[PDB]
């Protein structure tokens, strides 16, 4: 679910397209490594606020972030913390990936 | 609560080659009250009740509280989506509508399993 | 927070689930994600949404049941009001409150176990016999499973389970009903009769042969 380049490393965390307010957070460690969180605002605008950028690039089926500190070392697993707020049911879901 | 899952989610089979989907009656339910099998056409999105026997085989354990379907010389249009509908240990008078139960606490329809035949 | 609250109601009837902020003070609708939602089922009963007003991802079963006063979730009040209770809702409903301000952090959650109950139609008995003789005890449309018993109404005492076969079915309204068919050996002076209880609604309903 992520690929390893530029002495970096991608992680791509993917999502229905349906939803269109949300909340993805990335965790390694148990520590939040990076953070996204999407809004549709009034007159039909969109707000992305991110308390932890690592370059995302959103794509609308999928989030990707990028971490250029490699930490091979102590390789864990990665979790994608993900919580849907439009459209209903709110629901968190968390899935998982090695290396 | 109860409800009913069934596997797999999705199965792409060879023509004429059996295929076999199985659901299971999760706990605290007691025992298979009655069974049911729809099947839905590709376009129309609405489900029909699969008749039992012949092509269509159906194997069930009590004790093992879960059913499984088989269908016999796939034709290639026979792909679409198959749910099946289980009920509390009580029976139903028609499966046309086990399916519009929804969290009933004695009948709950399958999640699904999308077959397309090649 | 979860605040477990039971809630129990009859078919038909409309009751009314709550999801209370202690303070009387009031709250931002512009600011507030409010979900009534099923814990388990995670169906969509209703919804608040801070910039539409179009409930369309709501269920097909609670399309147009569920309601929230808006007046009242300015209060601070997000109480479900469901209407024509049916029995697939007896269900734990999760009120769930998340304010945008607070990075979506839950403000108010409540899980509301609601229980249903309906009353059986009155037994019908007959007396068909063979070889020894067999009967026939008919009601329905009740919720939730009924308890059926037989009784030697000439000394009002209770007939063993082992004489009787019971087969109930789901109305297709999630109601039920029931057969039951008792098989005794002959006798004059039989006087006996037919007994539906609903034990969730502690009422007990009696029919003589
Ligand atoms: C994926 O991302 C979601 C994002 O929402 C996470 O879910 C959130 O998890 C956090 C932490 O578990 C939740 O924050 C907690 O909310 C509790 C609500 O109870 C009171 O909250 C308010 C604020 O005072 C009161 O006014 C109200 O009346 C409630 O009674 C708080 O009680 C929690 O504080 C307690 O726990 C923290 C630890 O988190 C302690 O440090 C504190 O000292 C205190 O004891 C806390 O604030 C948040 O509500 C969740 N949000 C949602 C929407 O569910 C997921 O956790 C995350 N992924 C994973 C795997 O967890
Ligand atoms: C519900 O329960 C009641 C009791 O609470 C049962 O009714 C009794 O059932 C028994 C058994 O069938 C009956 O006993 C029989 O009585 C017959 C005559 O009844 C009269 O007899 C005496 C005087 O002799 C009166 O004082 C009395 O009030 C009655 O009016 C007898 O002819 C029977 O004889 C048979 O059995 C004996 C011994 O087994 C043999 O020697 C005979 O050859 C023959 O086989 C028998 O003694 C009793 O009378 C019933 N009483 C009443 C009031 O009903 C119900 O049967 C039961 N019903 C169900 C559905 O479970
Ligand atoms: C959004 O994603 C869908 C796939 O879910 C794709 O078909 C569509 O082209 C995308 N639209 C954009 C990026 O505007
Ligand atoms: C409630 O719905 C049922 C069917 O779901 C219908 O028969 C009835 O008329 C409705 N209204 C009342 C007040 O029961
Ligand atoms: C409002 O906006 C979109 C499009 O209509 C929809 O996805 C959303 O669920 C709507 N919600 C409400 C509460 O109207
Ligand atoms: C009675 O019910 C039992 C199950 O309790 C069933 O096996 C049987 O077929 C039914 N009929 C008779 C005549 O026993
Ligand atoms: C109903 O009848 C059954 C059988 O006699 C009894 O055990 C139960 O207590 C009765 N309850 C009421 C409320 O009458
Ligand atoms: C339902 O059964 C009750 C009591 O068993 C009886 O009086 C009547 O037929 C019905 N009414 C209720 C709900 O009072």
């Given at each position: 679910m992520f690929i390893f380049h530029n002495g970096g490393v991608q992680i791509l965390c993917k999502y229905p397209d349906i939803v269109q307010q949300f909340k993805m957070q990335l965790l390694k460690g148990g520590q939040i490594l990076c953070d996204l969180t999407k809004t549709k605002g009034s007159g039909n605008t969109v707000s992305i606020k991110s308390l932890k950028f690592c370059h995302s690039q959103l794509s609308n089926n999928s989030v990707s972030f990028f971490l250029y500190n490699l930490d091979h070392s102590h390789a864990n697993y990665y979790f994608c913390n993900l919580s849907i707020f439009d459209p209903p049911p709110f629901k968190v879901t968390l899935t998982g990936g090695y290396l | 609560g109860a409800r009913v899952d069934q596997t797999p989610r999705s199965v792409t089979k060879e023509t004429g080659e059996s295929l076999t989907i199985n659901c299971v009656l999760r706990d605290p339910s007691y025992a298979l009250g009655s069974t049911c099998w729809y099947r839905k056409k590709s376009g129309s999105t609405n489900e029909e009740s699969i008749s039992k026997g012949g092509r269509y085989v159906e194997t069930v354990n009590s004790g093992s509280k879960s059913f499984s379907l088989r269908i016999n010389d796939l034709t290639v249009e026979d792909g679409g989506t198959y749910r099946c509908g289980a009920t509390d240990t009580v029976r139903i008078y028609s499966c046309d509508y086990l399916c519009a139960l929804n969290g009933h606490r004695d009948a709950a329809c399958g999640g699904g399993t999308v077959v397309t035949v090649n | 927070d979860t605040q477990e609250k039971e809630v129990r109601a009859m078919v038909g009837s409309d009751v009314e689930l709550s999801c209370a902020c202690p303070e009387g003070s009031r709250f931002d609708l512009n600011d507030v994600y409010v979900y009534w939602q099923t814990s388990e089922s995670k169906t969509v009963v209703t919804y608040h949404i801070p910039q539409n007003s179009s409930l369309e991802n709501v269920d097909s079963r609670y399309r147009n049941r569920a309601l929230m006063s808006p007046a009242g979730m300015l209060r601070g009040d997000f109480s479900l009001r469901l209407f024509?209770?049916?029995?697939?809702?007896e269900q734990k409903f999760h009120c769930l409150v998340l304010s945008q301000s607070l990075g979506f952090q839950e403000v108010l959650s409540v899980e509301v176990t609601l229980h249903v109950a309906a009353n059986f139609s009155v037994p019908v008995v007959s007396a068909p016999h063979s070889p020894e003789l067999t009967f026939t005890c008919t009601s329905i449309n009740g919720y939730p499973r009924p308890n059926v018993y037989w009784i030697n109404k000439t000394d009002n005492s209770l007939l063993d389970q082992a004489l009787q076969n019971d087969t109930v079915f789901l109305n297709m309204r999630g109601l039920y009903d029931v057969v039951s068919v008792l098989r005794i050996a002959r006798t004059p002076s039989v006087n006996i009769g037919c007994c539906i209880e609903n034990v969730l609604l502690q009422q007990n309903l009696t029919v003589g042969s």
């Open positions: - | - | 024509n209770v049916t029995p697939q809702d």
